[PDB]
Amino acid sequence: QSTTEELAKTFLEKFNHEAEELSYQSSLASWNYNTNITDENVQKMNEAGAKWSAFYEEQSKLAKTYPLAEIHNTTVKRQLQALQQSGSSVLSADKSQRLNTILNAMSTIYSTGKACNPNNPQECLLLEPGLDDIMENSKDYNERLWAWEGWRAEVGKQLRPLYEEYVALKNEMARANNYEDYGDYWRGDYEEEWTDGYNYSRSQLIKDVEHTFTQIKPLYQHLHAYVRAKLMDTYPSRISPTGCLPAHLLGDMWGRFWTNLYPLTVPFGQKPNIDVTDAMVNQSWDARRIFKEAEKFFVSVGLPNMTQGFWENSMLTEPGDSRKVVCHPTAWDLGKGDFRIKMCTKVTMDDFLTAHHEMGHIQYDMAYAVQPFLLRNGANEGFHEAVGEIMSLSAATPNHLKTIGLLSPGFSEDSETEINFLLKQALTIVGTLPFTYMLEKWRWMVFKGEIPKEQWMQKWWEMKREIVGVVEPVPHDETYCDPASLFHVANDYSFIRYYTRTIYQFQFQEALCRIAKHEGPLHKCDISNSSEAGKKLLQMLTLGKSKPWTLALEHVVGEKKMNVTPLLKYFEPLFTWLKEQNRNSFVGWNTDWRPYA
Amino acid sequence: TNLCPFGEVFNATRFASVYAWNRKRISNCVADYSVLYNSASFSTFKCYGVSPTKLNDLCFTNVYADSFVIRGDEVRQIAPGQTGKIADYNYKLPDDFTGCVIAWNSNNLDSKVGGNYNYLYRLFRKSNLKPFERDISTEIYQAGSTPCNGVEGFNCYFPLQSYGFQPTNGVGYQPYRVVVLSFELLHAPATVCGP
Ligand SMILES: [Zn+2]
């Protein structure tokens, strides 16, 4: 007779040539909605999405009729494993509907909640753009404090019981899916089997993330102490010299990034950063010119050119005629080929760099398109964005701004222009690693059970003060659900993808620089005009999820584990400068300090 | 003199699905294939056995023109000694294929907004095909041992799947009209010879 693999291959050949069309239809519907917001477009998009989801659920149910123990070929085993994931199709219809309505309630109460302070009952604004502008631009203590506490009190207190019931239902779902809890379910994306030598357990990810964080602790401690020293200028009587940093004074609502904190701690305030905006408008550059330059940069390293359909179906410019387009920079893989970008491009430098990021997303998408449908994705949750980020890294180099003709050849990179750029980079890159690690660790410990529901806020600020070096401005009791104030926690999104990604990119770039024979510090590296590094990256990009992410990572960087040495080497000049200017200051944070007393 | 009906195969209005590819036999002609080879209206033009030359030197018995439509990345499957869905279950070319394959993008005529699903291909089969064999039988492909009773069910799939041709459709999955010419030569007065 036949085997299980001979039947599973037949079942997956019928699933692919249906999922192809049924996902391309939904993608075309969502694209037509995003490029032109109407009322009937929403109806068409919902119809296509419902059809695709129903078909996918039916095929997922049909797939589990084959056990993986009787399957030996790993190329079919991985597709079967990706299709067998039932999600929430295992609970009873009652609980499967209760969880979905709880998710919808949590996701719609986050986008609708507002916050208003005393002294102005009419000053009652949403998170965006009301509280967003406040937490992103303001420099007043009380103005940031009231917005922070309002967004966490009039929105998180309404999410706490929903989050408790959601945690319970998700734990039930995960236990029914043969897991420990929902955190184990989330770590399941890093789980690796069916390959000896490159196997990776779901518990190994915790050890790796906890080990690579102990290495960044000195660099992050120096950066945090430098920021705290340069923040006592803008806040003379609001920050302790040996304590930690208040959570509402970090440049955004939660303190995820420290980028908006740049024009407060910049090393040399008299030297201007290399912004090419005026040089771009003076050269009559338009959006199509920006994307043609990005295509030039990508072809310079050996990656193929954008298809013709990219240059006629992508919304590179804003319509601005009658269509209320929601244009957030996003790269689109519309199923059968059809790679597009829906960015509202302007003539500036930020849209010059962010176009390279989206084009790198498109390049990663175009690479693994040769894989089977179920294997068309990144190796894990942190590869796509890493490929996207290394491209912007190599493009933002002054040696790149001088080659394309944007910058004048009669320009020299000062010994100080290297420190402002590196400081801003550490602000946007290094300042987010403790935040991500702490948030995901709290979520894992909550899902497992090391934190009872009576210590959810007790352990949250504990891990904050002990990991990221950030303290709450005012204490929060157990009714608060401060973690749910973040878009990813209230909308059920895994967060560790933003940690590992940050570690992979520097592993790539360094490697991609070694093949480029770049001699010098690892912040002036420019992989342009180097087909060797481009080919080495393309060898890994076309893999997709076909092979374990450990072997895919070992292809490029030579190492199998998650290595943070390239990241620490990237910020080595900044590390030395920070160690120098941290001579008469306290490096480290004492959790005993409280900004409320 | 002996004008050949090349308009009803290349300039045809409708083409047949690859699972039911349309074979047209032509004879008693003084043919001129340089009219199309030197037209730059094709994306793929590959001639195996005989050179892609002017070809004004060949006497033929008859010429088969097998026309069908596939997507882009499957045109490479229309080649001798190739494996895949189109080569194994839809259209077979023997390793002695004296002829050529012409293929041109048809994103304008065979794909419309919403999706053109008039083109089918055989996705499953019990075995491979003979040289130049057609398989139109719609018998349900039984994977295991349980009978399908004539309707789909457990491990029973339909042997035909429709092509999802859309207008955008990046060039890999874009529709492509493929005409494969095969000029046979056997014991005959060779009624089909060029100038
Ligand atoms: Zn991105």
Residue numbers in the entry:
A (entry chain A): 18 to 614
B (entry chain B): 333 to 527
Task: Show me the paper's own sentences about this structure.
Here, we screened 26 animal counterparts of the human ACE2 (hACE2), the receptor for SARS-CoV-2 and SARS-CoV, and found that the ACE2s from various species, including pets, domestic animals and multiple wild animals, could bind to SARS-CoV-2 receptor binding domain (RBD) and facilitate the transduction of SARS-CoV-2 pseudovirus. Currently, there are multiple evidences showing the susceptibility of cat to SARS-CoV-2 infection, including the experimental infection data, the serological study in Wuhan, as well as the binding characterizations in this study.
To further elucidate the molecular basis of the cACE2 binding to SARS-CoV-2 RBD, we prepared the SARS-CoV-2 RBD-cACE2 complex by in vitro mixture of the two proteins and then purified via a gel filtration. The cryo-EM complex structure was solved at 3 Å resolution with one SARS-CoV-2 RBD binding to a single cACE2 molecule. The overall structure with one SARS-CoV-2 RBD bound to one cACE2 molecule resembles the complex structure of the SARS-CoV-2 RBD binding with hACE2, with the root mean square deviation of 0.763 Å for 648 Cα atoms. In particular, residue D355 of the cACE2 formed three H-bonds with the SARS-CoV-2 RBD, but hACE2 D355 formed vdw interaction with the SARS-CoV-2 RBD.
